[PDB]
Design a binder for this molecule. Structure first.
Ligand SMILES: O=C(O)Cc1cc(=O)oc2c(O)c(O)ccc12
Ligand SMILES: [Mn+2]
Ligand SMILES: [Mn+2]
Length: 133
């Protein structure tokens, strides 16, 4: 079915490093990205969870990118959902992400381990984590 993930990075395409952070007690969160072209975004979230913020971040990257995009996440949870290539989810947010994925021409989704010195990943982590932490 209909959408396909690239097997290797798209050379020359904007690369979005995404992350989210949420506070357990307070349920406040942030989602965001930084790109290799100097683009950045951080949005505040309420009544959220870590996994929801990580999915929110990918949705933003998808909304704000062109038809070809590389996305680098540290979330295995999100990776799983997207690599599974579902038709429909019970989650509205996942369905929105799916809708956006179909509208892309090429999407590469990479995973990196959190807090292991990957440049872009550390950058966005610091962004979304500030004030939440
Ligand atoms: O790697 C970990 O310890 C858990 C973890 C998973 C994830 O998806 O995102 C994370 C993150 O953004 C952090 O700042 C710290 C830990 C995680
Ligand atoms: Mn993360
Ligand atoms: Mn982080």
């Amino acid at each position: 079915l209909w959408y396909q993930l690239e097997k290797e990075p798209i050379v020359g395409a904007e690369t979005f490093y995404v992350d989210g952070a949420a506070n357990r007690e307070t349920k406040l969160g942030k989602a965001g990205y930084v790109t290799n072209k100097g683009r950045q975004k951080v949005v505040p979230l309420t009544n959220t969870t870590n996994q929801k913020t990580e999915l929110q971040a990918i949705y933003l990257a998808l909304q704000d990118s062109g038809l070809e995009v590389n996305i680098v996440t540290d979330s295995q949870y999100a990776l799983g959902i997207i690599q599974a290539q579902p038709d429909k989810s019970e989650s509205e947010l996942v369905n929105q992400i799916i809708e956006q994925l179909i509208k892309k021409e090429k999407v590469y989704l990479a995973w990196v381990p959190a807090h292991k010195g990957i440049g872009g990943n550390e950058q966005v982590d610091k962004l979304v984590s500030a004030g939440i932490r």
